Design an enzyme around this catalytic site. Structure first.
Site, PDB file in Angstrom:
ATOM      1  N   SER B  40     -45.234   5.420 161.824  1.00 19.03           N
ATOM      2  CA  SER B  40     -46.204   4.395 162.238  1.00 19.03           C
ATOM      3  C   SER B  40     -46.727   3.616 161.120  1.00 19.03           C
ATOM      4  CB  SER B  40     -47.072   5.010 163.088  1.00 19.03           C
ATOM      5  OG  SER B  40     -47.911   5.949 162.381  1.00 19.03           O
ATOM      6  N   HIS B 158     -42.074  20.786 154.414  1.00 19.51           N
ATOM      7  CA  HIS B 158     -42.378  21.234 155.761  1.00 19.51           C
ATOM      8  C   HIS B 158     -41.887  22.955 156.029  1.00 19.51           C
ATOM      9  CE1 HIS B 158     -42.171  16.706 156.002  1.00 19.51           C
ATOM     10  NE2 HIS B 158     -43.537  16.867 156.578  1.00 19.51           N
ATOM     11  N   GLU B 167     -32.580  20.589 152.504  1.00 13.47           N
ATOM     12  CA  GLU B 167     -31.835  21.068 153.385  1.00 13.47           C
ATOM     13  C   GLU B 167     -30.659  21.493 152.853  1.00 13.47           C
ATOM     14  OE1 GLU B 167     -30.953  17.239 155.817  1.00 13.47           O
ATOM     15  OE2 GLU B 167     -33.125  16.911 156.176  1.00 13.47           O
ATOM     16  N   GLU B 210     -35.167  21.566 163.074  1.00 14.04           N
ATOM     17  CA  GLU B 210     -33.798  21.482 163.528  1.00 14.04           C
ATOM     18  C   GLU B 210     -32.842  22.490 163.488  1.00 14.04           C
ATOM     19  OE1 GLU B 210     -32.626  18.917 159.807  1.00 14.04           O
ATOM     20  OE2 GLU B 210     -34.555  17.924 159.785  1.00 14.04           O
ATOM     21  N   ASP B 245     -29.522  17.969 150.959  1.00 12.45           N
ATOM     22  CA  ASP B 245     -30.681  16.933 151.000  1.00 12.45           C
ATOM     23  C   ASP B 245     -31.967  17.599 150.121  1.00 12.45           C
ATOM     24  OD1 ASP B 245     -32.507  14.972 151.149  1.00 12.45           O
ATOM     25  OD2 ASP B 245     -32.818  15.245 153.214  1.00 12.45           O
ATOM     26  N   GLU B 293     -28.102  14.305 148.963  1.00 19.98           N
ATOM     27  CA  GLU B 293     -29.025  13.268 149.425  1.00 19.98           C
ATOM     28  C   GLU B 293     -30.257  13.247 148.687  1.00 19.98           C
ATOM     29  OE1 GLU B 293     -29.368  13.559 153.734  1.00 19.98           O
ATOM     30  OE2 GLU B 293     -31.522  12.761 153.660  1.00 19.98           O
ATOM     31  N   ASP B 318     -31.582   8.299 151.366  1.00 22.26           N
ATOM     32  CA  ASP B 318     -32.184   8.446 152.798  1.00 22.26           C
ATOM     33  C   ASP B 318     -33.767   7.837 152.324  1.00 22.26           C
ATOM     34  OD1 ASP B 318     -34.050   9.102 154.996  1.00 22.26           O
ATOM     35  OD2 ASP B 318     -33.885  11.162 154.384  1.00 22.26           O
ATOM     36  N   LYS B 343     -30.609   5.950 160.133  1.00 20.36           N
ATOM     37  CA  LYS B 343     -31.540   6.118 161.176  1.00 20.36           C
ATOM     38  C   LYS B 343     -31.788   4.990 161.873  1.00 20.36           C
ATOM     39  CE  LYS B 343     -33.521   9.960 158.381  1.00 20.36           C
ATOM     40  NZ  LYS B 343     -34.769  10.252 157.438  1.00 20.36           N
ATOM     41  N   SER B 370     -27.758   9.851 161.140  1.00 24.04           N
ATOM     42  CA  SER B 370     -28.701  10.965 161.153  1.00 24.04           C
ATOM     43  C   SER B 370     -29.469  11.050 162.244  1.00 24.04           C
ATOM     44  CB  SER B 370     -29.382  10.795 160.027  1.00 24.04           C
ATOM     45  OG  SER B 370     -30.678  11.882 159.853  1.00 24.04           O
ATOM     46  N   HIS B 371     -29.813  12.397 162.689  1.00 22.92           N
ATOM     47  CA  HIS B 371     -31.151  12.613 163.781  1.00 22.92           C
ATOM     48  C   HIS B 371     -32.349  12.389 163.147  1.00 22.92           C
ATOM     49  CE1 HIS B 371     -31.154  17.067 162.095  1.00 22.92           C
ATOM     50  NE2 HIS B 371     -31.247  16.187 160.940  1.00 22.92           N
ATOM     51  N   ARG B 372     -33.405  12.546 163.917  1.00 19.31           N
ATOM     52  CA  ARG B 372     -34.966  12.642 163.180  1.00 19.31           C
ATOM     53  C   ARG B 372     -35.252  14.170 163.549  1.00 19.31           C
ATOM     54  NH1 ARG B 372     -36.946   7.890 161.683  1.00 19.31           N
ATOM     55  NH2 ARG B 372     -38.007   9.224 159.865  1.00 19.31           N
ATOM     56  N   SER B 373     -36.362  14.473 162.999  1.00 19.26           N
ATOM     57  CA  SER B 373     -37.024  15.624 163.259  1.00 19.26           C
ATOM     58  C   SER B 373     -37.426  15.915 164.580  1.00 19.26           C
ATOM     59  CB  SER B 373     -38.295  16.158 162.316  1.00 19.26           C
ATOM     60  OG  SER B 373     -38.648  15.079 161.973  1.00 19.26           O
ATOM     61  N   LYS B 394     -25.063  14.235 160.554  1.00 25.68           N
ATOM     62  CA  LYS B 394     -26.052  15.367 160.444  1.00 25.68           C
ATOM     63  C   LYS B 394     -26.779  15.244 161.701  1.00 25.68           C
ATOM     64  CE  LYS B 394     -29.804  14.148 157.526  1.00 25.68           C
ATOM     65  NZ  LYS B 394     -30.522  14.703 155.870  1.00 25.68           N
TER      66      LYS B 394
HETATM   67 MG   LIG Z   1     -33.589  13.191 154.002  1.00 25.49          MG
END
Ligand SMILES: [Mg+2]
Ligand SMILES: [Mg+2]
Lengths: 435, 434
Positions: B40, B158, B167, B210, B245, B293, B318, B343, B370-373, B394
């Protein structure tokens, strides 16, 4: 009826990374898809899940055999019988009789259920009504009820690596104004719980279990209850949230007593009697808003369940006691061992039998709580099921992991579709028809 | 071709936060899509609109984005009477109606939800599967099943371990099919769980956002050795390779890098970008590491350029690129990296996502979808990676159904294509090569 055009089954992966059955049924109305949640491939009282047992493939958990049973035998036989897709009873009866065994071990309980589920979805479409309405019709229920959700947010028991002996600590937003608001309350309490855990137990204490809850390294079941209380108060809903527990006491029964530190090396000196265990539950009820306890005693400790229930006024739920099994349930009713049935569709193996079991418990004055399994999928059938059966209560995970949220989101969509006619069970969760 | 009804709602994502879902109805039925979590605030990506009511879902509601669809954007699109198959004209229309560079009038989450639902409806109107419609929009004659990249060991900002890199992924490039890539990935994952439980304890196997594990380790070499152990226990050392990553922006400190950044501050342990590069060369020499990455900070351009010129593996942008055309053009000109992480919600429309992929591929880059979290039960990105023919995706460990939903849909796509299905396998970087 020539409604059924094609039946095809495949192996997909469940939420734990293990194979399960998915079935596509095609009619002139389209494609209807259902998947089966993980169950049990052995056991005396439940329907038998068929697993391949090839140790070199998916660690023995493949379902190629069950899938082949549908594609090669069960599917073709059903299509040839030309039965109406709306006649769930006749379809399930046919499949049960073709299998011919008490525990669905010819084709697999997972093979039969996969077909049963897809047929049910197709039947709703043939009738031009929502799945939740078709289920109510099948149950002889004129009305529909949105359930209170029961979220398993603190986790102990055999499958958690903490010492906490009791299995599930759940929050129920009975004081919510609607299902949509029950989700808001549930999620906010969960988010505050995570922050409390990070602060108190550490930055490494916030990963989740199979159902999306947390497993802090605690021993005392009172400390688990106090965490729920802290999270409810932090979110600001003390007046609207109550607590449900799953003890799963069969997991810690040994030599006639109960071990509340059973994940520590064997020591009978710490074991307590069934009577002292019942006294502990009464303290829970006195000190915390505990309104429901599942599997308080071992699955064969019948006299202790019966004595306990006669002296409390809360909900007492059978899971391992009853195993969605008619004969076991009948014993429980006769002995007054419990007053609520946990309903796991895959333990019995057909939509019709699941509905029958619910209605029989209800006719004896019991509640029914619809349940997920630990291995779930993206399938949302049990959301429509609980609404049509009017039970007033479902447990299908913490508000975390989409095999859990898929059900909760579907319940939100159902309430949306019903508009100003929607009724949320709220404080009548145990029996939505109560005055 | 005609759109009949558009309706948006608020649902919960896989972490328990609200997000946007849109239903679009045509004569062919209902087409439903949901948006994965994004950002955001930020300079280089499309802006997700959040309500910011601190008392409701901790400020993360999406009522405003949903109402923007129901009250303004949806009715405006319907009045325009555009063909549901003309993805380009629909997306252009919404982009111009919003009229900002970052989609901040309606929200990137509002625009994308509509864009996704329109694409699903358009495929049906044309009589082709979703993956085929996407391939049509991209100008691709063929369809390619991707190698899946499963994030099975987790560190960085995280997770609460000391492990600095974010990752650690396994890629079953030696599988015979997508179905077999899933079997290999799942078996490796199950063996890894056991390896971790025995080494680090019964309390070490709960999972992250994930679906991966966060054992309490410090050394990035130990993460790699854990993967090696699991791969050998499963019996696939000849068929699985490793992707990483780093997310190095998370541990960039005053021009150096801190590989113990979650421990109490000590600048004496920080290392140069050159030293960090030498460490990556060791990973590449001693393990089957084929892809890295964000090896360096998002603004450390000279270091990316220098590093890439001396390595023969895949290097993925990324945080460097942020699915942003201007950032991507800089990375192309400077030869900073050679693969784009895609993304869709960072850019905010299906059309722009496809254009970004094509521009990358036209410059000889790979693309990893790619996905998101924060994910949902939506499987759009499965069809997307197959139609874009990128050869690589991924979208999670093989755990948690917001991850498995995509992997299961890729197996169903393979099944539908039958004996003509092409699996990228060892050509994952560029399926058209050789
Ligand atoms: Mg990344
Ligand atoms: Mg239980």
């Amino acid at each position: 009826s020539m409604a059924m055009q094609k039946i095809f089954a495949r192996e997909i992966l469940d939420s734990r990374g293990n194979p399960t059955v998915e079935v596509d049924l095609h009619t002139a109305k389209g494609r209807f898809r259902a998947a089966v949640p993980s169950g049990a491939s052995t056991g005396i009282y439940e329907a038998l899940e068929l697993r391949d047992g090839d140790k070199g493939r998916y660690l023995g958990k493949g379902v190629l055999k069950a899938v082949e049973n549908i594609n090669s035998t069960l599917g073709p036989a059903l299509l040839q019988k030309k039965l109406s897709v709306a006649d769930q009873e006749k379809v399930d009866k046919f499949m049960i009789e073709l299998d011919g065994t008490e525990n669905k071990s010819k084709f697999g309980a997972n093979a039969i259920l996969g077909v049963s589920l897809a047929v049910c979805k197709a039947g709703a479409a043939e009738k031009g009504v929502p799945l939740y309405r078709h289920i109510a019709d099948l149950a002889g229920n004129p009305d529909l009820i949105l359930p209170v959700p029961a979220f398993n947010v603190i986790n102990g028991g055999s499958h958690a690596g903490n010492k906490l002996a009791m299995q599930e600590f759940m929050i129920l937003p009975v004081g919510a104004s609607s299902f949509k608001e029950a989700m808001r309350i549930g999620a906010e309490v969960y988010h505050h719980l995570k922050g409390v855990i990070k602060a108190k137990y550490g930055k490494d204490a916030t990963n989740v279990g199979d159902e999306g809850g947390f497993a802090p390294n605690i021993l005392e079941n009172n400390e688990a209850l106090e965490l729920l209380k802290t999270a409810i108060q932090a979110a600001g809903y003390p007046d609207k949230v109550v607590i449900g527990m799953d003890v799963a006491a069969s997991e810690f029964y040994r030599n006639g007593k109960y071990d509340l530190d059973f994940k520590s090396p064997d020591d009978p000196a710490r074991h307590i009697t069934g009577e002292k265990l019942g006294e502990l539950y009464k303290s829970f009820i006195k000190n915390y808003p505990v309104v429901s306890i599942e599997d308080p005693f071992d699955q064969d400790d019948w006299a202790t369940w019966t004595s306990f229930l006669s002296g409390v006024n809360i909900q007492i739920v059978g899971d391992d006691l009853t195993v969605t099994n008619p004969k076991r349930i009948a014993q429980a009713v006769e002995k007054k061992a419990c007053n609520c049935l946990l309903l796991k569709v895959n333990q019995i193996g057909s939509v019709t039998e699941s509905i029958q079991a619910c209605k029989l418990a209800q006719s004896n004055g019991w509640g029914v709580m619809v349940s997920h399994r630990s291995g779930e999928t993206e399938d949302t059938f049990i959301a429509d099921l609980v609404v049509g059966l009017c039970t007033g209560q479902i447990k299908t995970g913490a508000p975390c992991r989409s095999e859990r949220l898929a059900k909760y989101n579907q319940l939100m969509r159902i309430e949306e579709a019903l508009g100003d006619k929607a009724i949320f069970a709220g404080r009548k969760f145990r029996n939505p028809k109560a005055k």
